[PDB]
Design a protein around this motif. Structure first.
Motif, PDB file in Angstrom:
ATOM      1  N   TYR A  35     -21.170 -37.922 -12.777  1.00 38.41           N
ATOM      2  CA  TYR A  35     -21.490 -37.179 -11.559  1.00 38.41           C
ATOM      3  C   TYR A  35     -22.559 -37.916 -10.772  1.00 38.41           C
ATOM      4  N   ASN A  61     -22.068 -26.476   1.401  1.00 43.77           N
ATOM      5  CA  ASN A  61     -21.519 -25.331   0.674  1.00 43.77           C
ATOM      6  C   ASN A  61     -20.372 -24.626   1.409  1.00 43.77           C
ATOM      7  N   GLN A  64     -16.726 -26.552   1.586  1.00 38.93           N
ATOM      8  CA  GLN A  64     -15.971 -26.967   0.400  1.00 38.93           C
ATOM      9  C   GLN A  64     -14.504 -26.523   0.467  1.00 38.93           C
ATOM     10  N   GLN A  65     -14.295 -25.275   0.894  1.00 38.05           N
ATOM     11  CA  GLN A  65     -12.959 -24.658   0.967  1.00 38.05           C
ATOM     12  C   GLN A  65     -12.077 -25.225   2.087  1.00 38.05           C
ATOM     13  N   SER A  67     -11.896 -28.346   3.445  1.00 40.53           N
ATOM     14  CA  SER A  67     -11.381 -29.699   3.302  1.00 40.53           C
ATOM     15  C   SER A  67     -11.766 -30.289   1.966  1.00 40.53           C
ATOM     16  N   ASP A  68     -10.930 -31.210   1.511  1.00 41.99           N
ATOM     17  CA  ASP A  68     -11.233 -32.015   0.347  1.00 41.99           C
ATOM     18  C   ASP A  68     -11.642 -33.438   0.789  1.00 41.99           C
ATOM     19  N   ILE A  71     -17.223 -34.376   0.535  1.00 42.40           N
ATOM     20  CA  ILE A  71     -17.649 -34.538  -0.840  1.00 42.40           C
ATOM     21  C   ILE A  71     -17.807 -33.178  -1.534  1.00 42.40           C
ATOM     22  N   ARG A  72     -17.585 -33.152  -2.844  1.00 40.86           N
ATOM     23  CA  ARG A  72     -17.618 -31.909  -3.598  1.00 40.86           C
ATOM     24  C   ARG A  72     -19.012 -31.647  -4.145  1.00 40.86           C
ATOM     25  N   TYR A  74     -20.725 -29.455  -6.698  1.00 38.18           N
ATOM     26  CA  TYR A  74     -20.384 -28.638  -7.863  1.00 38.18           C
ATOM     27  C   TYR A  74     -21.397 -27.543  -8.111  1.00 38.18           C
ATOM     28  N   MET A  87     -22.978 -33.562  -7.433  1.00 39.55           N
ATOM     29  CA  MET A  87     -21.847 -33.896  -6.573  1.00 39.55           C
ATOM     30  C   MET A  87     -20.875 -34.861  -7.268  1.00 39.55           C
ATOM     31  N   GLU A  88     -19.765 -35.151  -6.596  1.00 40.74           N
ATOM     32  CA  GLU A  88     -18.858 -36.208  -7.010  1.00 40.74           C
ATOM     33  C   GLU A  88     -19.608 -37.519  -7.041  1.00 40.74           C
ATOM     34  N   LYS A 146     -14.309 -39.750   1.650  1.00 44.03           N
ATOM     35  CA  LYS A 146     -14.909 -38.434   1.722  1.00 44.03           C
ATOM     36  C   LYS A 146     -16.236 -38.509   2.460  1.00 44.03           C
TER      37      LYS A 146
END
Ligand SMILES: Cn1cc(-c2ccc(Nc3ccc(C#N)c(NC4CCCCC4)n3)cc2OCC#N)cn1
Length: 258
Positions: A35, A61, A64-65, A67-68, A71-72, A74, A87-88, A146
């Motif tokens: 990570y 925050n 997140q929903q 687009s992918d 960056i994610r 977590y 994060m990723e 991303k």
């Protein structure tokens, strides 16, 4: 050699980046999974400086929903002293990947472009103009670009005016079309191996060159006339004449398999 974020324990392998305030690490959790943790030091930042990171986290925050191509994030921890962002990790930032490559595959570049558009389009839909778009803002994860941040935070290195739009410079005496200009130069960098004003080292001459219509951006002929069309439309000094991101997405270059 250890970070605790919301119960979970992460071990610091190395460091990827460092701002004045913050730090980015490559880490492993208890399951040996990789990570990236953005640690920000809040000792001590102005009331205003605080809100910037709060805003960046909030929008990262909320998005997140949607687009992918963002960056994610977590999990995250925030106190009065620090912030931790799990994060990723990804593979590498776009800025570095551009330097460590000599010639860029056209098929890769088109898919990278399509990705950036999607990402920047997303933030636009939520009233966020990135005021400082640059390759270092994009992360390659499985060959997929991303968006890392939204320019609300304070930027980070592993300081150029190459990607700066004319309207921002003429402002001294915001539009979503600014990101379109910055994205243009990034694709210009992917196309001609350099940014449109890179070679002008004199900073008072470079900024004057950007705004000046009499200065003409050279477009060498490439085997992709559409890629050319995109490059010219994005690099138009007048933001009303400049192409929009929804237009860019209906453009043949991204839509036509050729
Ligand atoms: C020359 N070089 C850069 C990288 C690199 C760079 C970034 C990342 N991953 C992430 C993951 C999350 C963030 C955030 N926030 C971030 N930020 C960096 C910090 C320094 C400036 C560039 C962006 N980077 C992973 C990277 O690869 C390591 C892995 N996995 C590898 N080689």
């Amino acid at each position: 050699e250890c970070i605790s974020v919301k119960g979970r324990i992460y071990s610091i392998l190395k460091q990827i980046g460092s701002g004045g305030s913050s730090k980015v690490f490559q880490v492993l959790n208890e399951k040996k999974q990789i990570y990236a943790i953005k640690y920000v030091n809040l000792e001590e930042a102005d009331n205003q400086t605080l809100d910037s990171y709060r805003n960046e986290i909030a929008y990262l925050n909320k998005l997140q929903q949607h687009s992918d191509k963002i960056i994610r994030l977590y999990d995250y921890e925030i106190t009065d002293q620090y912030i931790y962002m799990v994060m990723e990790c990804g593979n590498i930032d776009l800025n570095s990947w551009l330097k460590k490559k000599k010639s860029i595959d056209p098929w890769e570049r088109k898919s990278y472009w399509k990705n950036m558009l999607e990402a920047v389009h997303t933030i636009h839909q939520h009233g966020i103009v990135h005021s400082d778009l640059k390759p270092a803002n994009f992360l390659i994860v499985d060959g997929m670009l991303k968006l890392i941040d939204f320019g609300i935070a304070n930027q980070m290195q592993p300081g150029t005016v190459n990607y700066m739009p004319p309207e921002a410079i003429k402002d001294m005496s915001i539009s979503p079309k600014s990101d379109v200009w910055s994205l243009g130069c990034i694709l210009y960098y992917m196309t001609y191996g350099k940014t449109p004003f890179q070679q002008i080292i004199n900073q008072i001459s470079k900024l004057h060159a950007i705004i000046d219509p009499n200065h003409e951006i050279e477009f060498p002929d490439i085997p992709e006339k559409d890629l050319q069309d995109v490059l010219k439309c994005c690099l138009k000094r007048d933001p009303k004449q400049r192409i929009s991101i929804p237009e860019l997405l209906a453009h043949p270059y991204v839509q036509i398999q050729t």
